[PDB]
Write a protein that binds this ligand. Sequence first.
Ligand code: ATP
Ligand code: ATP
Ligand code: ATP
Ligand code: MG
Ligand code: MG
Ligand code: MG
Lengths: 233, 403, 413, 232, 176
Amino acid sequence: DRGVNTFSPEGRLFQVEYAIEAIKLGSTAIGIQTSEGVCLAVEKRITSPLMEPSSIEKIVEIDAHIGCAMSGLIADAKTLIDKARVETQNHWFTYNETMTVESVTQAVSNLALQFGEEDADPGAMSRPFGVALLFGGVDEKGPQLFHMDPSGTFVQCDARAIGSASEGAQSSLQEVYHKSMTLKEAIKSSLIILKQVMEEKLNATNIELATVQPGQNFHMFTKEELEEVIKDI
Amino acid sequence: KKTKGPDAASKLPLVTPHTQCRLKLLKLERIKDYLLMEEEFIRNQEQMKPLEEKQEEERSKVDDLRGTPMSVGTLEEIIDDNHAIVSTSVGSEHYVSILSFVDKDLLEPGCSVLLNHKVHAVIGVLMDDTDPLVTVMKVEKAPQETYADIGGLDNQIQEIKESVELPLTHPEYYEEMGIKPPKGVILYGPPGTGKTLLAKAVANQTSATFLRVVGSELIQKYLGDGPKLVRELFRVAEEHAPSIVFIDEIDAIGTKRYDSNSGGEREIQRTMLELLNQLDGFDSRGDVKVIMATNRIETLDPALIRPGRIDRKIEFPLPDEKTKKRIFQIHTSRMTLADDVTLDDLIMAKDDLSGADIKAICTEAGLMALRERRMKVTNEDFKKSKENVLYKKQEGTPEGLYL
Amino acid sequence: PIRALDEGDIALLKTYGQSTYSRQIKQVEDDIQQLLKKINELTGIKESDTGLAPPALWDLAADKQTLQSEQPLQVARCTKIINADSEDPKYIINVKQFAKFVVDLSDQVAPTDIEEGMRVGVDRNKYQIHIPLPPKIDPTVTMMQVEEKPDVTYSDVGGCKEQIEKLREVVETPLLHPERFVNLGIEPPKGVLLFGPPGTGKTLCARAVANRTDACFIRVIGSELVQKYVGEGARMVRELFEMARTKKACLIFFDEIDAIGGARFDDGAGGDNEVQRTMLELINQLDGFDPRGNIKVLMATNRPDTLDPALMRPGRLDRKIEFSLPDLEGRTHIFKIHARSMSVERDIRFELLARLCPNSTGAEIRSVCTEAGMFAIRARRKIATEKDFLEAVNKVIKSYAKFSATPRYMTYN
Amino acid sequence: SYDRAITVFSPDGHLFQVEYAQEAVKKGSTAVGVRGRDIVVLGVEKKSVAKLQDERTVRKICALDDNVCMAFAGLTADARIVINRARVECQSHRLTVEDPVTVEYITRYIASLKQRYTQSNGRRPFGISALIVGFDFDGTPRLYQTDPSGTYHAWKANAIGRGAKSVREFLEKNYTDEAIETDDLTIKLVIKALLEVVQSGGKNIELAVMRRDQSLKILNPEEIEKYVAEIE
Amino acid sequence: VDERPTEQYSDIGGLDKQIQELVEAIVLPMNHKEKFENLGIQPPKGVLMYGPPGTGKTLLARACAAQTKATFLKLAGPQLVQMFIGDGAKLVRDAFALAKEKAPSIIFIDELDAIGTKRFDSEKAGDREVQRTMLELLNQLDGFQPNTQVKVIAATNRVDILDPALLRSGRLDRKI
Ligand SMILES: Nc1ncnc2c1ncn2[C@@H]1O[C@H](COP(=O)(O)OP(=O)(O)OP(=O)(O)O)[C@@H](O)[C@H]1O
Ligand SMILES: Nc1ncnc2c1ncn2[C@@H]1O[C@H](COP(=O)(O)OP(=O)(O)OP(=O)(O)O)[C@@H](O)[C@H]1O
Ligand SMILES: Nc1ncnc2c1ncn2[C@@H]1O[C@H](COP(=O)(O)OP(=O)(O)OP(=O)(O)O)[C@@H](O)[C@H]1O
Ligand SMILES: [Mg+2]
Ligand SMILES: [Mg+2]
Ligand SMILES: [Mg+2]
């Protein structure tokens, strides 16, 4: 009944629609692209004080110039991250260069929606990945920010927020973001919006923040740095 | 008028000590003393005050003019000041004359109107036509229980008290913020866990006009009588002053609606629709608050359980550890327990033990005691009750599947 | 080994136990029980035989004048006339349920004053005709008009602007401004049926219309549409529409039409037979070889899927309106509307509660705004706080009364 | 080769089969693990000794490696299988990396194994949640929990199976550096937590302890009885 | 039908190949009766408009009206049923009456699915008067020879439930 590959009366796939819906349940994540660099922030959403907040990694590195922020079935995000890293290193090994952000996202996206049931593979994926990746990095073209939805659709975006607070996080990003914004201004604006959407009071332990700049590599802010920014924000 | 007709009860201000004692004797004697005083005074003053020039000759005239066997009929489109149309039980439209005794006001269309047998003439109004099948649901002998009788349900009792008692006890507390007091709480939980006990508790300290329903007596066999008995019930409720109507076992008229094929399972649906319409529909609802009890909250049609019609869904669960000891204390008091039958042990073991189980164990325990010819319960008399009261129950997973 | 209990055993058992004053206690309790009965018996339920106007306001006439009213002025019986033989004084009447007859016209009434179809006051004994009776206006049918203005405006109906505009396009403008529908000659759609999950304001918007209907807003009490005797329901609906076609711009609301309407069938007891007949009469009146006129119908249901097709098709109901769950902005506006009368701290962010209440309905938004200051009343404060509201949300919706996913369940991060 | 999509999204964004497996983890036994300053303790509440069952073969605590052990709560057979796959991987990593596995690494492998069983074709989600403890090369004690969903996390302490949340709440209010000041306090801390769920106590809970250098040690019934008396 | 509605066979869509079938059950046999006997074939005195909901049955009905000039006779399924036993009988008896009177006209029994339902019955039979009404209508239809000219056509949104007798031979026989 209702095979995974089925069409609705509107021409809409059922599974792809559901998977996109599941995204809303995930925590918030804000990614802003600026000429000085690209910044990412996220809400850790600590379940319980016993849990070690270090082990909830919502911002990982794909290469020295690429970073990703996740939201959705974090279990599903793992395989997507592994493919991105392998593709980046394979490209370096063959062409002795650094893959561009769009190319990595295109490679990752090509993994999304490559699922089936009959005559596909001995152990192919059955269902779509329910996670929305915010790729951010610096390439020959400068800073780049790409959002990826479960539908395998990636589209460069100036500023975007994903997660349960996406609607309203985007709205706030709309009123503040502008082309000439600097990295620090992006970081602060990102922190405020994350603070507004976050029910729990925002402190230095419940939010992961990272940035990529033309000079420096992918950098994940430490507690000392995080405290400094939220002190003024 | 909206008379706040109470339960016409509480004639027992409640004897404070329950242990046979001369304090009990003296207090009950005081109760009897005042009761006898009342009887004496009423009889004496009935006999005295020689107002025997009574009957107010004039009222005798009125009774004379309104003959014997007066008939009950439904007033209809009123034609003229001194003329109106009536409809007898056979549905025949006579054209009668409203006599002077009748107050021209209070006679609206659809109001039952008295008549003279021979010459149909509106002789007087009747403002008591409550369906004799509906007036039988007014509690007039308040059940004898108090919130202290129930135990171990603090959190689940405060919730009902905050919507059946406080809103009319200190209503300033609510208006001061403007939140409208919650109306209607559904008490859902496993069998034998309270429910009816809390209902009777709230009946006791009513201060209102409790109406009791059954959950099946509403259903009627004549098309429409179903969705008119409920109408009459709530009409009576709103006519009387603040009231709480307990629609017990609402699992009966609550089944999830479906595209049915029978007739009875459509009349019942119409009954539920009438309930929904009136409880929250184009209208209002005065100080009428509805308490619903059910064993299965998953079966009730989403609608009769909505956060505008039935808020504050209480979740009466199977009793927990401390609540078990509390209930044993409350249900073992009036027994002469021995000195080695402390109940601090019978608790635990089985994870399934409800309040009904507790009372059964406590009763088939005294009955067990009355078998060795003793009136002081014993620890063996209690350990021989768990094997005779709690039985026939179902079991669970096979050991090994899990630990 | 359970030997029975002997009579002596019972006797001794009843008397070995602490009863210093217990026989007296039981006796006095019995005396109290038997005394309550005497007290109420002698103070029984009296002074309930009302129905008497105070023969003081009209005390003077409340006398032999009444007898004068009696005796003369013979009580007549109502009856219709199915024919009036022209130039032949004989008339034919059908009383109601008794039988038909041929009647003579009393001298006191001129034949011209008596016509075909009017209600005559036939007398008993010999059925003669007297003072005619005006056309009936049934009590059940006439007890349906709004005759009031419920305290709900459009403003308070938040969270749905497209829905309100759609409803207004058929319930208000096509009657309060015919100009716009002539320049284009667009026939104003008539018949709006409101769907929606259980509790979304489907009845709120219906009530809101009543505050600006500036005409009759007959509210069909569906339960009244069904009565014991056959044909009663069909007559009820016919009188409903006949009174409808007597004023200007009448709107008739059928709240919870699921009760009267349903898929037809002849399997179970021939269906409802009578109920289906009433539904068919309604359908015929709405559409048929008898143009309705200037009467519009609004109907609401929780499940439109269980409606008879001959009633869901356009013509009878044109402008179907989904009433879907509110959006984020809808939720924010709904909270604001059902919070403007609450002693709430100024620093409360209502844009956050909206996100924290996903897939909720308006009734839930209320039950959250309320039961929000209820925790404040529990704490004995006077100005609720944001923490209070958030706790209310967590204790009302999302987790509501059952949260199974909790023990080491944090897979959505 | 049966290749039907067993687990597939459902409206409102959820995976039924993953949820259902989670409840199966709930109905199991209660198992508790706490991370001390220099000691990591696991405990379990035994449903029934049965007075005939040989306690040897019903152990619900096992050693994946000399420096890693775990406790679970859920379908036993699913638990035995998962342990075997972890054991072979631990040796394989030892073979290649030439170093003992890390608790974080093995947790990722086991978690990655479960994640592959929910998404795969013609397969059922593993009905177990595992608590993995061990001392890394640096010596820092580690505690990891894995759910059937494949999500894994690092904890100071937590409880799975029947009577999980209540126990965890007990852990949350009662966990502190002072309680983790001494090894005995940690061990007693565990027992009280299980006693919060299990009734009999002393004879209904099996306890195990792992130290920095010493391998896994299972507390004898006498030792468990002694600690229970000390708490009382 | 005093109002005599104003439909014409250009305000109606797709009604060809069935509009003519109604024509030769309404207008031709009544207008030019002679040439039907010219051969000796009469179009049965009944046409049933079976068709899914809201397909246009009443549309073609009012089309046959207006352009009939024969005092169209109109009825209603639910209207037939009445309260006091036999009142529906009088209604139906008269309805087929006053048809011989004002001889030229055609009767359309809308919502026929209600007045006549499959021959279910109640052991009490107290609520079985509708069956008596339907049998009365059937009798009237039977007592009708093509010599007289008063046609009858009716619509049934659900041909399933109609009593499989109103379609026997000479009662409603032509189907559109
Ligand atoms: N916690 C409790 N404390 C005191 N008495 C209790 C408790 N739980 C149950 N009982 C007793 O159990 C008896 C059985 O009736 P009870 O009112 O409890 O049933 P119920 O929960 O309403 O059942 P039902 O599911 O049939 O509606 C009552 O006399 C009540 O006093
Ligand atoms: N969008 C909204 N904005 C403001 N108030 C709303 C909204 N939706 C619902 N409400 C509130 O919900 C309350 C309860 O609604 P009610 O149950 O009377 O009607 P309904 O939603 O149409 O449901 P039903 O299906 O029972 O007719 C109303 O008093 C109304 O104020
Ligand atoms: N084939 C058609 N072409 C054009 N208009 C049509 C057609 N069928 C119906 N209509 C329009 O539908 C409107 C509503 O009535 P309609 O003719 O649909 O009823 P119906 O199909 O005869 O109904 P029912 O069979 O339920 O009695 C009419 O005003 C008519 O103009
Ligand atoms: Mg009751
Ligand atoms: Mg409604
Ligand atoms: Mg077909």
